[PDB]
Amino acid sequence: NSVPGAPNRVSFAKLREPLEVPGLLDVQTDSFEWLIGSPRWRESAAERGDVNPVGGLEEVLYELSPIEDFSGSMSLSFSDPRFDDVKAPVDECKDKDMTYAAPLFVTAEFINNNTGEIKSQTVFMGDFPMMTEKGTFIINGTERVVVSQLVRSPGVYFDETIDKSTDKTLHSVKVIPSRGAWLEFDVDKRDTVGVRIDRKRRQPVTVLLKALGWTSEQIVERFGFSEIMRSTLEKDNTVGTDEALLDIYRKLRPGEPPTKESAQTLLENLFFKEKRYDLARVGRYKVNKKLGLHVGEPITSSTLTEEDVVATIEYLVRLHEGQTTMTVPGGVEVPVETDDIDHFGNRRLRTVGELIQNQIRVGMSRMERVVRERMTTQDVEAITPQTLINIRPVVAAIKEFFGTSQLSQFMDQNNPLSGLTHKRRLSALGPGGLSRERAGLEVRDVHPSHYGRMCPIETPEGPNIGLIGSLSVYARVNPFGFIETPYRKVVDGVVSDEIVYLTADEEDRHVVAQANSPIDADGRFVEPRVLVRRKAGEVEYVPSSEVDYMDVSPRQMVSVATAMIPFLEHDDANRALMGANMQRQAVPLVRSEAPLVGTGMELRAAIDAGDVVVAEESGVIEEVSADYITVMHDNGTRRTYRMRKFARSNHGTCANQCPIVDAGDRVEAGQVIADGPCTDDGEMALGKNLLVAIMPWEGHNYEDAIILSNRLVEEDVLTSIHIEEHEIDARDTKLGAEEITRDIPNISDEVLADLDERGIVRIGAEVRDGDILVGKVTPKGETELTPEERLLRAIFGEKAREVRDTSLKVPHGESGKVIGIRVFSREDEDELPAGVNELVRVYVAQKRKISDGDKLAGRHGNKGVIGKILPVEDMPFLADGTPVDIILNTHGVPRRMNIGQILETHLGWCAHSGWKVDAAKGVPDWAARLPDELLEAQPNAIVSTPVFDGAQEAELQGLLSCTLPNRDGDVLVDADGKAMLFDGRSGEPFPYPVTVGYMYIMKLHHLVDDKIHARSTGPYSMITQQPLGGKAQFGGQRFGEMECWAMQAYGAAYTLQELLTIKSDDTVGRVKVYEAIVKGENIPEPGIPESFKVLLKELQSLCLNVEVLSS
């Protein structure tokens, strides 16, 4: 429901949902339209207060303007950014290898103070790349996703450590800004209060207080409660503000002579001025919230203050003393406690608009440096904003962010789930956040403040586990960058329908119930004591009126890819992590059916991903073809929607779109009008439903291998289309110009048969490994030919052929049909790089059957390669005569704790066969909580068990005991879920019943045709002469240290020597080995490897006299 033409998927769920799932690309689109300053953002911010908001671009231009030279006689300031329409639409940008962008215009203004003159222009600032309707960027023709970054927010961070020599609690502070110099405040093993101002040595805090200008009477009056402060005031042996400033200056800038004004202004121009220190709006907000300084005041003047420094030291000494509350004079009370730096109220999120804003700010700093620099040279009253402004650094900053950055990534296009999960990703690493090797084991953990904000399950399993996560389903992001999650407000024990979005601090202040606690039909709790979540991750039982919030749903804590695993709470967390990560490696198949047992997430994850065509406005379908759908709206006007037929995605797969509407059908707004890569009738469909048996079978499924039927090869069940793109270009050389032609040097007319009369293949032609695709030739020059070659040319009459053949050929192991050619030319005014006269792209598509070595999976972490593809007739078959389609091994299930796959197999059999609960003498006791019209189902019913609220084991037992016969009255699978099978080879019945059912398996993008390589002799490196590495070359395999130790442990001196000399490095021995194999002789003796000679020349060039001695 709520989607206008959705298929009827009956749900096993028992609880009502108060809040619908949000837009699942809001994390991208809301941030970028904040950065623009869209009217949609402006009214959405006007809804949440009238706080006079400013966009990201206006914020950067306001904090930059006005730019003034040293004399103060002239100023340049910016205002009012504007965007034109985009230069070309998204499909044209992708087709023509362009960037989807819009021109940005700002209003610059120049003031000459001594006369009074306003010279105002309108300055073009560059082609700003725009975000499409799905949260992506088309940068140079490719679709890119900017990933949000998890960082530590600026603020004050109090913490304590316990000593191990004296066993004292040593408290400390760090106040860390964005863009500034740090300062700390320790309390050491002696009773002293220190300062390490800007990572210098140490000094007592009274030095810093006197340098700020505090007398000892003032210090005693303020810190009169602290014996620590009294002792460190007495033991400092430095009295006087000038003396303290001298003591600071003597170590802060060592070597510079202390002048009085420089010493007096060093502290102010290091911290308190907006040039070199500005903790941001978030940092000022967090400092004011921690110390309680300004309660309701709007956040401005984001530099540090002396009241902030004195409040920090006062907080530190009261924390060391052991109090729990304090108040600064002129503020509110705050609790006194230490800080956790991994807490999600201290970890913020630099989203896409903020990352682009930082790069704009970096570019405009260089622009204003050049503004001052050429403002001093040029004659005044002759200059104007377009003579002051050089926009080339801003253009280059945005360009080098969008290409070659860590957080601007190639979009994951395997299926719609990969695409939707690449957005909504929170990566902790990148430029400005922690590394991978230098990251501790404490930031890779799941913290109790991730509940509802980050998913505990979905994370990589490689060396990135914990450093990349995913947003939860209901989570929002603050104006400041903090992740919120919604809660239902409960008052006097009655759960109302107010939804409040709480960040992790306010959640720590309250006590939050659980979404499945019982409710007496008006909101009032049924039980007397409710299970809750308290301040520190404590889970208790409190009285029912102590509660003041409640989760909106179970599965509030999970993400999109994790909410699609049925029966998740019966799987262990390792196998759920694997299942969620393998779900976004499935390939699009040629037919794509939807699961029998799913959760309810598959529809919304398919509409929100965007590979489905959705009717924007209601109408009636006027004309359908395979290329377009044109609907005629209710007021005259029509609209046609082109489909994307057989388009290569970023990873080689196919991106077909198929209409699913008839030619007179009435559609509604929001109704799915055409399918996508991996969807069936509008909902995400990544695999196929296959009949499974859970026996072992003759060793062919030993240790996660898999046996398949040959029906899945004959009937094209698991068959997929993969497209490859090959590119060549013909540019100018020193000796002439390369050209694309059929008149190649000496090759036969056999290999020139499929080439049209410009040297490109014909569309539809089958290509093998080594076939010419584009015939190119380059000018060679003049060389000296061998006497043997000259004699052969004189015998056979051939000429010199002053051009050298360098064509584009199909690489090793590839084939397919040529389906498309895209040629760009210099003379037709296509925008090619300098030098290139022509560029040709050929598309070769092939259709891949399933074969052994290919990797399949289910949704519960059960992967495995195919070991055998049996014939149909030697497969275990039911008493019907029906063969099974896949055989999975028994030994792999119970030691992995993923019996969600077994309960899915049972429910899938019941959904295939259908059922009918016998409510003759009333409803049976196990079906008392079953929703009505789950009390019968037709064959091939689609059902849905949601994640933490689904079908119970009592319900699966009952539905197994009532299920429909096949064609005769023959119930083939008994009340345990087990069937009697026959052996396909011997013919005898298997002696015990076997578990059968329908599991939804999917085919993963780890196919054999990409994995296999071999090499006898190929390319070699340049400095050291060892083989290159990789399948993209020919590429050798590496024989490293551990393999050498295995050879030495065996005792294989000759095998090891031959591997390390005449198979890598011995340059004159490689050729003699080849010649000796071909002539049939004995393999010769090895020589010195070339890497040893390179080592000796590097040791000699470090001035070391290394020499080899004889005897």
Binding site: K1097, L1104, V1106, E1107, V1108, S1110
Partner: protein, 98 residues
Amino acid sequence: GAMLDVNFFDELRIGLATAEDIRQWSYGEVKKPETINYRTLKPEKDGLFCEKIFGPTRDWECYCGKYKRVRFKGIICERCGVEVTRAKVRRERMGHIE
């Protein structure tokens, strides 16, 4: 001891090279911070890629093309100074900066 490295080694000795060792290994002094010509892409004389110091770029040719076969093997061209020999000696000849 051995310098061509035919594999009868007994020892490998390391030590500290003096200036006489350095300017005895060297085949010539490099005295320009030049690498190749920007137009013809051929090495510059006395530069970091010089053929008179480090040996020729093409097998058995000099720099000016005056001597171009194995018949002239081991002689030095009287014009450009490039010894006509193999091109793989540019992995073996050192130079020095004074």
